[PDB]
């Protein structure tokens, strides 16, 4: 009629927890401080997936900061150890580089292009690349003169500059 794990070695409680998936670990993680520490074990799925989740929220925000030319905010998020070159299906194969470009955020795009290694021809899940979007931007009359200049500079950067 009292605590069952109370007299169990922590090693073997973890092993029992190793059979549980994140949803369940979450539930038992809130029975007490004891199980809170143990279910959030570095080696278990709750801690692991919670990272990809934290990373995912941060990615979304980075996308917005980039698109709105908010360079200082992009720098803040980047300072939290995120790799903006790394994309996948969940993120529609888009990058904050492509975000900046669509948002006319050419300073931010220059920042990202220079500061990180991006594939400028890599199409997202809408079929768009940094180059292709920048180029379609250039063919567009609604784009002001100095904008269309900042762009050519970028196209030339991505097409002609060194790599590695």
């Amino acid at each position: 009629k009292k605590n069952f794990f109370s007299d169990l070695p922590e090693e073997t409680i973890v092993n029992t927890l190793s059979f549980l998936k994140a949803n369940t670990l979450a539930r038992i993680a809130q029975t007490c401080q004891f199980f809170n520490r143990l279910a959030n074990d570095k080696h278990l799925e709750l801690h692991q997936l919670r990272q990809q989740h934290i990373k995912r929220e941060l990615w979304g925000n980075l996308m917005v900061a980039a698109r709105s030319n908010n360079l200082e905010e992009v720098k803040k998020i980047l300072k939290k150890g995120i790799d903006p070159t790394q994309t996948n299906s969940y993120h529609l194969n888009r990058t904050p580089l492509l975000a900046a470009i669509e948002g006319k955020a050419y300073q931010t795009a220059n920042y990202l292009w220079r500061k990180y290694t991006f594939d400028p021809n890599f199409k997202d899940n809408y079929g768009d690349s940094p180059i292709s979007l920048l180029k379609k931007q250039l063919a567009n009359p609604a784009f002001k003169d100095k904008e269309k200049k900042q762009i050519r500079a970028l196209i030339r950067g991505m097409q002609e500059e060194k790599i590695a």
Binding site: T12, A26, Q30, Q33
Partner: protein, 146 residues
């Protein structure tokens, strides 16, 4: 082939070696002295539990990612015991270092945790909720996404 173990109760169990050697602990002991007579004490097991683990090891003498649903039918029936007994089997599994038993018992406890509410979890295992509402709500919110 036969040897005998003594529980903490004082009671003596005579078992074939093959079976007994499934406890790595026991297996180690036999090297640390004459292998192959005279009983060997197991101070951290009572006879009720010991009797049980003898059953388990016999049934398994032959044999050869983490899924909780593949416990053989025999073991599920074997582990149809009270929670007291279940945790003493785990401790025995530890003490005697029988990996197979350790798994199924642990798995059995894990399935007890599956599909439950934090409070039902506590009600099942007599876990005293010590979290203040504020700090509990915090892990609650912290674990939104599942």
């Amino acid at each position: 082939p036969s040897i005998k173990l003594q529980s903490s109760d004082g009671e003596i169990f005579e078992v074939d070696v093959e079976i007994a050697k499934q406890s790595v602990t026991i297996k180690t002991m036999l090297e640390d002295l004459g292998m192959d007579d005279d009983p060997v004490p197991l101070p951290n097991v009572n006879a009720a539990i010991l009797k049980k683990v003898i059953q388990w090891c016999t049934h398994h003498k032959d044999d050869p990612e983490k899924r909780t649903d593949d416990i053989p039918v025999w073991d599920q029936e074997f582990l149809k015991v009270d929670q007291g007994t279940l945790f003493e089997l785990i401790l025995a599994a530890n003490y005697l270092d029988i990996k197979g038993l350790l798994d199924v018992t642990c798995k059995t406890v894990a399935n007890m945790i599956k599909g439950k509410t934090p409070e039902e979890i506590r009600k099942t295992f007599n876990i005293k909720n010590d979290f203040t509402e504020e700090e509990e709500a915090q892990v609650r919110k912290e674990n939104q996404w599942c």
